[PDB]
Every structure is written in C-alpha cells, then in structure tokens.
Amino acid sequence: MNIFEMLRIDEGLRLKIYKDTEGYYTIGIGHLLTKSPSLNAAKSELDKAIGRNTNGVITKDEAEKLFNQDVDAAVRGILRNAKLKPVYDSLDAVRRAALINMVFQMGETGVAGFTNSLRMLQQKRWDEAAVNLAKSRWYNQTPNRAKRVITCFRTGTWDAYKNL
Ligand SMILES: [Cl-]
Ligand SMILES: [Cl-]
C-alpha cells in the first residue's frame, strides 16, 4: 500500500467532470477544478489544466498525470508549511501518508488549522489525537473516509485500507 493507492481508493476515478461531496466541479482522481457554480468555468479550468480542448472528458493517462502533480504538490505544500513540516518530519511512513491524504483533501490551510490534533500527533499520543480529529466538520461530512485516515494515525498500519 502507498499514498497513490490510498488516495485512489478514497477518491475514485472519473473521466468526466463531476461534483464532489461539497458540490464542487472535479475530475479524475479527486482533482478539484473550481469552486464556481458554473460548468463553463469548470470546463475552462479543465482545458487550461490539460492543455487542450477537452469538452469535459479526459483520458486515463491525463487523469493520472493530474494525480501525480497533485500528490507532488501536497507533499511540497506540507514541507513548505511551518506548522505542518515539523509534524510530518516527526512521523513514520504510514502516518506521513495519512497527513498527505488530509492535505490532498482539504488543503494545507485547512489541515494546518487542526492545531491541537497536530500537537498530539507530534507527541505521539495516538488515541488522543484520533478522538480529537473526530471532533471536526471533516469527520461529520465524510465519516467513512475520515475513519480510514484516523485509523492510520491510531495504529500506524494500513489495516483500514486492506480489503478495499
Ligand atoms: Cl493543474
Ligand atoms: Cl466518506
């Protein structure tokens, strides 16, 4: 198991423009296009991202290329973020993957806001951090995914993703 496989399970793969859990235009493997309510604005972002006139549909290869970029960017956002970097550096491989997942989903800013959970992760107080992470909009809106990520923080294993 790895970050790519993990996120592929969490996000799925769709080759046509679609709406995410928040109603935002997205495509591929959870690649957010825009928060604007207009499909045309979404089509425009897509063409700009892919480099061609897409008509809202992409190939698998195209989807995978956006995915590669997005993971890379998440990692880089973590390393450049003063609050996130130290956490990330303190964690083991599985848990680092969990932090990347949250950043991929909610952005560097959103995660950097989980101040208390971050402090707990850094201190390696696993059960306590899992309980704190659950007291969030994130958990209440996407509970199954959140439970999977949280299990990773709690146990340090990929158990929640094995079967899927
Ligand atoms: Cl892009
Ligand atoms: Cl979910």
Curated annotation (Swiss-Prot):
CDD domains associated with the record: T4-like_lys (cd00735)
What outcome is documented for mutating residue 26 to H in this protein?
Facilitates transglycosylation more effectively than hydrolysis; covalently bound substrate
**InterPro entries reported in the protein's UniProt record:** Endolysin_T4_type (IPR034690), Glyco_hydro_24 (IPR002196), Lysozyme-like_dom_sf (IPR023346), Lysozyme_dom_sf (IPR023347), Phage_lysozyme-like (IPR052619), T4-type_lysozyme (IPR001165)
Where's it mainly located? Answer: host cell
Q: What is the effect of changing residue 132 to I?
A: 5-fold decrease in enzymatic activity
Changing residue 132 to M/F has the effect of: 2-fold decrease in enzymatic activity
Q: How does activity depend on pH?
A: Optimum pH is 7.3.
Q: Where does substrate bind?
A: 32, 104, 117, 132
Localization annotation: Host cytoplasm
What changing residue 117 to V does, per the record, is: 50-fold decrease in enzymatic activity
Q: What is this protein called?
A: Endolysin
